[model samples]
Every structure is written in structure tokens, then in C-alpha cells.
Target chain A: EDPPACGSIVPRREWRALASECRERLTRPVRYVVVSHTAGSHCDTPASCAQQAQNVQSYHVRNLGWCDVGYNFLIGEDGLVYEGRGWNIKGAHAGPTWNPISIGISFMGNYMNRVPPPRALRAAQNLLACGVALGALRSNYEVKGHRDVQPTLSPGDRLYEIIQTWSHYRA
Target chain B: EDPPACGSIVPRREWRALASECRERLTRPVRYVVVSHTAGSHCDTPASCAQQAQNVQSYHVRNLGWCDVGYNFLIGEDGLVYEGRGWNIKGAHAGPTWNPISIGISFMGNYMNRVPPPRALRAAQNLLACGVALGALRSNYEVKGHRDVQPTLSPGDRLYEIIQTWSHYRA
Candidate 1:
């Protein structure tokens, strides 16, 4: 019973993601889905989304000296999902405490003032459902904003407000 | 780099794989393939092989409290490969020294006296080729019997003898 791959998300190759060095597989049926905003520029087209994905990777690998991009997945304002560490590997997006138990999904844009577009939000939810369907996430997984666990304005105020309305959001 | 799926190998979902907690990644173009044996009983049918895979994971996770199955791949006498930690993940088979650099592939049974059937051997060689094709292993990747790097008679005498005849076998 091989689990299904997450839905409609762009594969890493399609977006030209660098090979990730983070190898830890999160315990499957991950208990949490932590949302965040990239807090950078956004992309709204296939080409732009791909470029944005590469830029994010470059920043993490070059500037941050991280093994790969920090998030498990990235959602584009273009309404497509970009694969980060994807469904299986542990992400470095959140702090070590939450990273192990959570799937960190960041929207590709700053959301402190403006919320992500409806398409972007929908893609994020679609990705989460896909994670549950593939058994990568627990059916009862909780949603948490990046700021919920970490001391940052991540996921941004406007977007974080929307996630709090999600049925799975806790605290 | 995205790991190309092993051709005709059983998917973890098909075998009802337990959620993996292991998070180590093997660096790309891995130069080594470390061969080992499970030191357990063998199976030659799909049903039995899948069960054997589950049992091995159980031993590692439940008994040993390991994060996940130790090997990157497990081969059955049934001639089908079963996914363990898989291509991108660093496996727990060898001790620290080799785990990060090599892909650990284990036969599902004791091979000291008994040799794996030809089909099983073919599956393994096929897997290595696939690894190289996917850039998971270097073009001139080397294969080392477990005994070559670790203090064990693993991969076994008969199997070890055979592998040594292969082009990639190294001391």
C-alpha cells in the first residue's frame, strides 16, 4: 500500500528545486500543519512561480547555509503548489520543536498587510487534504500559524487570521 | 534531486508501511551501495515478501526503537524490491561512518549458506542502475559488501562471493 503522492502539487524537478540534504522523514500521519508566509515577493504565473521557488531555494542554501529550502511545501499566488521538502521529509521552516511534528507550508508572498489570494489559500487547503489522503498527515491534524509556535510574524497577520477560521486550527 | 521510483519495486503503501520517523538524507550521487542481509527467513512470493518487509520495519521501529527501517532498500527472494527508507533518505544499516554516503541494500534473509535466486540478484542490479540513472548514485558508484565496511558477515559468504564478480564491487 504505497501512499499516494500529494495532489496537484508541482514536483521539485518541474520547479528546479535543488536537491535537499534534509533526510529525516516526519512520522507519517503528521499531527500538525503549520502555515507561514514567505514574507518576500510573490509570484502569480507559472514562470514566476518557478522562479520564486528557485529564489527561495537559493536564499536558503546560499544565504542561510541550509541544506535546502526550509518549508515542506510552498504555495504560489499563481494558484499552484511548489514542492519544498514535500510530504515526507522533515522541514526546517519551523523551530526544531515543531518542525519534527509538523508539516511546514509557506505561501509565497508577504501577508502581513494583504492576505493571499483565494486561489493561493485554496491551494494550501488542497495540499493539506492531499497530505491526509496520502496518509502523510493525520486525518485530525491541527493547523497552526508560524507565529503560534515561533516568535515571528511569519505567516503574516492577514493570512494567519484566515487560518484561524479553519476548522482544524488550534489556539 | 527527486528520486526516480525503482522499477517494479513494491510501493510502501502496497505493503501497508508504517509511518517513517527517520529523517536522514543521503547526499546525491552517493558513491557507495552497501550490501547486507536481514539475517532472517526468506520469502519467494509477493504476499510473503510484503509481510517480511513489515516485520523488518516492526523489528527496527518497535523493538529497536529506531526511527524507521534501517536500509534504503530491501530485496526479497521473491525477486521484488521492497522500499525501506528509499533513495533520498540516509539509512541506518551501517554505523555512522558509511550511512551518510552509501545506500544500504539488504536481502531479506540469511545468505551465509543460501544464495538469493537469480531474479533477486537481477532486481538488485537493476535498482543500482536506476539509482545511477536518477543521479542518486554516481555513474561509477561502488558496491561494498557489509562485511567490507562493518564487522559482520552480512550480505553473506555466498552472496558476497557473487557480488565480488560484478563490475562495481569494491573492497
Candidate 2:
């Protein structure tokens, strides 16, 4: 199926990604969207963001023994979204508690010190809407910070504050 | 609510258990039952089994920073089941992925070296039937060993072998 993304997207192939061997499929329309931050360097241009996506994927695959990147999708400061596991597959972004039930989307850099740029925020919003349109997410899906469900601080203080103001956000 | 166990069960109060502070309820009727083992020492008599249950609860609440004992029910070599998180509340025995979706029943002893005795196995089977009668578990619920879903030697070699022979086991 053509990925029904509503935002500008850098497909995995475009990012020069290694083949994923994960087989677990998500049972959707999923009810939660977990927002997180990579805590790595930010990338504003398409080429830089694509490279960052590979960096994240490489860490998960080689270092952590994950079959693919942890997030279902990754957001870039360049106002583009990069597909990771995508909508149909289950991701490892959140702990097992939220993994099977939510789609995880991570910003490319640390948000604790600085908020992701405005275009990056807009790109994430478009991706969420796209999830609803594709019947991959429930229209009434709740948005949550990765910290809310797990013990760690993620999606950063600045970004966490921003998501709290969103119409779909819930504790 | 009365636990509705088809087999003999030692209620939490009867075991002198600490009151649970957990508030997260399982969204029943749950579709899965995950069998596991504590991998601790076995207790055969009623008094000893009850004490073993208390020991497990103390470790979880004090050492693990958990709300209570991790399993929904604990089976004993004495052929009795100990009410833990019970049928209504969620337990932390399984990893996050399966924790919320399944009723976790852990046998109270190391089973890698040997199988739980016939009485303990019978007690667990009866407990599964109890879950169905109470409407806490689906009639067509599936059973799985903890090792099948998580990366652990839980439910151990012999016990894992036994659960696979159950009528409802999936993978």
C-alpha cells in the first residue's frame, strides 16, 4: 500500500537504510501516539535528516539488536518525516506497555535543551492526521509523551509542554 | 469481589498480605494467559506456601518498586493458588507487551531443573477455568509460556514444555 503520509516524507530507501527483518504486525487502528526525542544532533536539511535517520537505525540494529529503528516514524527539523517501521508494523520505541498499542514518532534531536523547530512540529501533526486517514490510528487516539508511560524523561521538557497543549493530548 | 476460583485459593487477606496500592485495572475479558515460574524455592505445605507467597510479595513491593506481587495468581506445590493482583487488577509479571493483555500465573519455585508437581499443575489448570467463569478471561483465551513472548528462561524448560500441550496455547 502506498504510505498515505500527509507530510513530506523520506522513505527508508531514500535514506539508504539496511533491510529490516521484523515480522510483527501491529493490530490497528491503534489508540495511542507516543512522542519522543532521539537526544542526538538535529538535522534541518533533507540530506542531513536522512543521514540522521540512518544513524538512529544503525544504533538500534547493531548496538541494541533490534530488527529495525525503534520508532514507527522519525521527525526532522527540516519539516520532513522519515519512515522507520511505518504504520503496519509494531515498533520498539515505547516499552512493551505501549509498543503494541501505539505508534511512536521521535524527533531527530534532544528537546530537553531546545524545542524542535516549528516546521518539525507541523510535520509531526500532519503525520498523525495521516494515521487517522489511513485507518491506522483511531480518530480519537490520545497523544502522550514517552515519559508519561515509561520511567525516563523523553520528548524533552520543552516538547512535552508543547504536546500537552495539543487537542488530542491526554495523560 | 469474591475471586471465583474453581480450585482452592488462599485469599490475600488470609495470607496476611499487605494491601495493594495498584489502581490499574485489567480490561477484561482478557484474551491471554501467560504461565511463568518464580524460580525460587518450592513450598509444599499450606503454611509454607502462604509464607512463600508473602516473601514474593515483599520482594516485589520493596525491592522491585512494584505496587504488589507481580503475578495475577501464584500456584503452590501444596495444590493451592494464592490470590495476587487477582482477576480484576493488572499485574506486572509479564513484560510490558504482554502484561496488560494477559493474566499472569506464576508457579512458586525453580522449574528449570524439574517440573512443578502434578498437584501444582492441576491447581493452575483449575485457576484458568475460574478466570473464564468469572468473565475475567475470554472463553477462547490463549495460553503462552513467558519465554515465548519475552527473552527469559521463565516458566523454565520443563514447565514451558508442559504449557505447550495445553488446549489454548498459541505460540
Candidate 3:
């Protein structure tokens, strides 16, 4: 998948190494990563997100961090995708069976903040496509925000509202 | 624990050998099982709950056709505790952690049609205590209803409601 223009492009190699240790080497490639959105709240800035990212990463590296930052990748309002532990390794983001073979991807911005910027939306779509390709998943793999799994209205109501239709998903 | 007045109770020697080989030789005990109200429609009959109780227990003796009625004991509106799967064996009731450690108990008739009758309520408490005595559980081990681990209104909303608040629980 080609990179979209709005977000910062991370060097693919950096993530590739992390992902290699994940499911890539495993017998079955990972097909999903149940995730949650950590947007809103005081930790919304680049500095805060990055610091949060570092701590989240350390939680994996230093502590029992599931995947780095507890996700395979992290997306932000700047329309950027930060490489997390990558796709191949197991993610500890969700509960039950899905956690073992799925890749966790999270967006850092509050999609419900007034209105989300165009750049963030585009970045999310583009990043999903890339991850899909990397993971070799069909479109039916489901492109959903966190609320689908649990009852809480997380990841911002707007982001969830945006991904509501197949057309939005197809786009 | 002594058996209560109801349908005939199988002797320990007979029931032990019967359910033991029903599954694998009790290496791991059954945990939990999903159960349903077999009260036909109304939860009003003492026979309604007894029918559910009989259904749960007979599933063990006869190949009464179920993926094994998924519980260790069945409780009736008359509050009779009917042993379903025999002694110390694991059950396939609780989806995630249902095993030999747990002797799944199901209360028949939809208690939510109204509050569970005195018999059913007392029966559940009795069986839970029995489970503790049987070495099936530690003194502090929990006696959980099916819905505690998942999202479902099965067994009825009212019974689940009461168990959440009033049921005797250790952990």
C-alpha cells in the first residue's frame, strides 16, 4: 500500500525488525489485534503521547508489556503512525482468544474532540491499509474502533461514528 | 452432602464410576457451562424447575443429548439440588475456565419470571457449600453463575441480579 501524504512516514525497517519477532516467524501469521483508544484526557499532546508511548513500550520491554506500547502500532492526530512492537509478536491489548494472534493498533488523539482534523482520518485509513497488507488480511478482517468489543464508548464517539459503514470501511 | 427429597439420588459408588469414565479420567475437573431455562415458558411450576433439574441430571446418566448439559448440579424451584455430572469431574460449562476445579451448577426454571423460589435459592446455597466440602473447591473458592464471565442474560436477569448481590461468595 502507498503511504498517504498527510502523516509522517516512519521508516519501514524499524518496525519490520520488531514484527519479525512477532507472528512472522510463527506458524500462523496474526490476523487481528483487539485494541482500545487512549485519546482524550490530559495525555493528548505530542510530548505526552510520545512519553506515554515510551512508557507503554517500556511496560513491554521493562515490565510484562505485551507488545510495545501494548500495541503493534500507534497513530496520532498529526496523521502519523508510530511503529510499536510491530505485527509479528503477540499483543496483550485485548482479552481472551483474540489477544494471542492479533495485532493491536491504537490512535492517540481524541476523535471526539469537537471535530477530528481531516489529516488524522486519512492517516488512520492509510495506516490500516498498510497494516492489512503487512498482515495479509482480507478486508473482512474488520476495521473497527474499540467499542465493538466492550461496552464503553472509547476511542471517541466520532471515530466510531466514522467507521460505521462499509463504504467508509471500503474507502 | 446428603441428597434431598426429589427424584431418586444415585449412590456415590454408582455415580462415581458412571460419570468418571463419561469424560477423560478426571485429570482436570470441569469448570462451567452455559445453561438455559427449560421451564418451557413459565417459571411457575415446581415441576417446571424440577423438569429443568431432571434435564440437567439425566443428561449425565443417559446420553440425553447435549454437549453434556454443561453443569455439575441443577437446582429446582423446590430448591432441590440435583447432581448433574457426577462427583469431582470437570464440566464444560464456564467457557474460559470451566474445568475439573469447578462443579458447574445450573438453577432450572427462569428465576427472572420472578425471584428464584425459596427452594432454588436455598438449593444453590446448599450445593455451593457442598462443592466446598467435596474438595472440588478450596474453602475460599468461588461459586460462580455462568453469566459472571460473559455477557448473556441466560438463567434470567433476575437470578443473575440476585447472585451478584446476595449469593454466598468467597472470592
How big is the positional error of residue A28 in model 2, measured in Å on the Cα after superposition? Answer: 1.6
Each model's backbone clash number: 14, 0, 25
Which whole-number lDDT from 0 to 100 does residue A102 have in model 3?
Answer: 61
What stretches of model 2 exceed 4 Å from their correct place? A1-5, B1-171
Write down the TM-score for model 3.
0.38
lDDT of 1: 0.83
Tens-place lDDT per residue, model 1, B18-125, is 998877777898999999999998887666788999999999999999988899999887656788998898999999899999999999999999998765786687
Ranking by TM-score: 1, 2, 3
Per-candidate TM-score against the hidden true structure: 0.50, 0.49, 0.38
Off by over 4 Å in 1: A2-6, B1-171
Best-performing candidate as measured by lDDT: 2
Indicate which candidate wins on DockQ.
1
Q: What is the lDDT of residue A140 in candidate 3?
A: 49
User: lDDT tens string, model 3, A22-66?
Assistant: 442222344443445666332323334445556455656567734
iRMS of candidate 1, Å? 17.1
**Please, what is the whole-model Cα lDDT of each candidate in the order they appear?**
0.83, 0.84, 0.49
lDDT by residue for model 2 over B31-150, one digit each (tens)? Answer: 999999999988876567879999999999999989999999998876557899998899998788888899999999989989976557766886786677678899999999999889
